[PDB]
Design a protein around this ligand. Structure first.
Ligand SMILES: C[C@]1(O)CC[C@H]2[C@@H]3CCC4=CC(=O)CCC4=C3C=C[C@@]21C
Length: 243
């Protein structure tokens, strides 16, 4: 009741990219649209996270940090879910006005990464993830990447993360054990994907001026300030099982 009531009530609604589907696809136009969509989704991720049960118990500085580190994985996870519920994972449903088909996957120069994300999407089907499990897993996904040196107040974070794990546990509840195993495995699988995208968007930002790919304000900031901390090993994901 209560926990899930909150997660359902705060789930963001549909977000459009504002892409112009009439002009021919192209590396520059597709990625620039994705970046605009990224900026827009970021606004929602922030509002969503701040409304999560117990989130404000975290030190104010830790709050923005965990959101900026988890942003990529969060977007990837929700996207895979939208792709599964809308186009049965046949394509990547980034937004109602920005669906990637085989051709866009290739023209965006993100084919292998898109293949990886499509696999994630398909897993929602293969595992028959319920909407409730999806919401719990997405929440937990927000608390799955932190600085090696710890946050301002690691204790509140560890406590909060532990609670979201217990919540996923209740929703699942020798079948419980098997289900918990496969869902935590799925959650772990998001990280390697998020890392490839972190590397890709970072490289893209550095040469964005040469390829005509625009990066909105807040994203350009996150990719140049928070993402390199992840790429250089200062910030690491928290895996359930050893990789
Ligand atoms: C194109 C790029 O710069 C590299 C990877 C892209 C990511 C891929 C994951 C993603 C999922 C969504 O549903 C919203 C937009 C979205 C992105 C928008 C811009 C990024 C960060």
């Amino acid at each position: 009741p209560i926990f899930l009531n909150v997660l359902e009530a705060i789930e963001p609604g549909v977000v459009c990219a504002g892409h112009d589907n009439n002009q021919p696809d192209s590396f520059a136009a597709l990625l620039s649209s994705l970046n605009e969509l990224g900026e827009r989704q970021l606004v929602h991720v922030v509002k969503w996270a701040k409304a999560l049960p117990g989130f404000r118990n975290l030190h104010v500085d830790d709050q923005m940090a965990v959101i900026q580190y988890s942003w990529m994985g969060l977007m990837v996870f929700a996207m895979g879910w939208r792709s599964f519920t809308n186009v049965n994972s046949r394509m990547l449903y980034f937004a109602p006005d920005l669906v990637f088909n085989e051709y866009r996957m290739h023209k965006s120069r993100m084919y292998s990464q898109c293949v990886r994300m499509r696999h994630l999407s398909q897993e929602f089907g293969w595992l028959q993830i319920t909407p409730q499990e999806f919401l719990c897993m997405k929440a937990l996904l927000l608390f799955s990447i932190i600085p090696v040196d710890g946050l301002k107040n690691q204790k509140f974070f560890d406590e909060l993360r532990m609670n979201y794990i217990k919540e996923l546990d209740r929703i699942i509840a020798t079948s419980c054990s098997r289900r918990f195993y496969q869902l935590t495995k799925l959650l772990d699988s998001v990280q390697p994907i998020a890392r490839e995208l972190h590397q890709f968007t970072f490289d893209l930002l550095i040469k964005s001026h040469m390829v005509s790919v625009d990066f909105p304000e807040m994203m350009a900031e996150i990719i140049s300030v928070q993402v390199p901390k992840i790429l250089s090993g200062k910030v690491k994901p928290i895996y359930f099982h050893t990789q």
